[PDB]
Structures are given as structure tokens and as C-alpha cells.
Amino acid sequence: IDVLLGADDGSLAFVPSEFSISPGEKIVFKNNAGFPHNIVFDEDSIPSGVDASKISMSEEDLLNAKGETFEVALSNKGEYSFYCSPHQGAGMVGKVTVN
Ligand SMILES: [Cu+2]
């Protein structure tokens, strides 16, 4: 599934921001508008026993050019909360369900 970082009107959002995938399906996050951006999974808001370090950017890492991507595949089922670190407060948050 492709997820834009930043809406085409420059809104600070994931598009889409809530979605479901099957296990081992790839998510391609692509720098769209309003970057730099990143993708960080909430360690306290993913399935038990998942290593967030395996599926996220560092807080300190950025995608700073149009079209840079980060890709990830999730396998454990459950809900995963993620955010953009610099824009979390702006509401640039999402949630994926692996079902
Ligand atoms: Cu952002």
C-alpha cells in the first residue's frame, strides 16, 4: 500500500492515515508535501513483543526530499500506532491494523 507523507494541498497528514493490511504486505511511505517527515511507531502502541526499532525510523532521522520513501512490512497481527516526530503535535498520526 502507498501512503503519502503530506497531502497534495500541503496538509500535514498521512494519506491514508487509517488502513488495514495483510501480514507481510509492504507499506511504502513516500515524501509528498510539507517535508521533512519521518515515520515512528509508538513502542507502547504496537502488538506485544514487536521490536519498534525493526519497523521505524529513528526520531532523529528525516526524509527531506520530495519522493524519498521508507518501506516496511509488518507480520504480527494487531493495531499499530505511528506518527511523524516533528509534526506529531500538528496531528500527523496514523494507525494500521494487520488482520
Ligand atoms: Cu511530518
Curated annotation (Swiss-Prot):
It is found in: Plastid, Chloroplast thylakoid membrane. The crystal structure with reduced Cu(1+) has also been determined. Its cofactor is Cu(2+). Keywords: Chloroplast, Copper, Electron transport, Membrane, Metal-binding, Plastid, Thylakoid, Transit peptide, Transport. GO terms for cellular component: chloroplast thylakoid lumen; chloroplast thylakoid membrane. It is a peripheral membrane protein. Residues 1-99 form the Plastocyanin-like domain. GO terms for molecular function: copper ion binding; electron transporter, transferring electrons from cytochrome b6/f complex of photosystem II activity. The keyword Phosphoprotein does not apply. Participates in electron transfer between P700 and the cytochrome b6-f complex in photosystem I. This is Plastocyanin A, chloroplastic. It comes from Populus nigra. The chain holds residues 70 to 168 of 168 of the full protein.
